[PDB]
Amino acid sequence: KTVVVTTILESPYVMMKKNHEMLEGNERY
Amino acid sequence: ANLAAFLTVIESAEDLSKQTEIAYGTLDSGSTKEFFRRSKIAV
Q: Which residues of B touch A15 (CB under 8 A)?
A: none
CB B8 within 8 A of CB B14: no
Query: Resolution, rounded to a tenth of an Å?
Result: 3.5
Give the single-character DSSP code of B17: H
Q: Which residue of A has its CA nearest to B41?
A: A18
For residue A12, say if its preceding peptide bond is cis, omega within 30 degrees of 0.
yes
CA distance B29 to B27: 6
CB B16 within 8 A of CB B24: yes
Cβ of A1 under 8 Å from any chain B Cβ?
Answer: no
CB A17 within 8 A of CB A23: yes
Cβ of A6 under 8 Å from any chain B Cβ?
Answer: no
Residue type, A16: M
Q: Which of A21, A22, A28, A18 lies closest to A7 in space, CA to CA?
A: A28
Q: Could you give the 3-state DSSP secondary structure of residue B33?
A: helix
B17 known ligand binder: no
Q: Could you give the 3-state DSSP secondary structure of residue B18?
A: helix
CA distance A1 to A19: 30
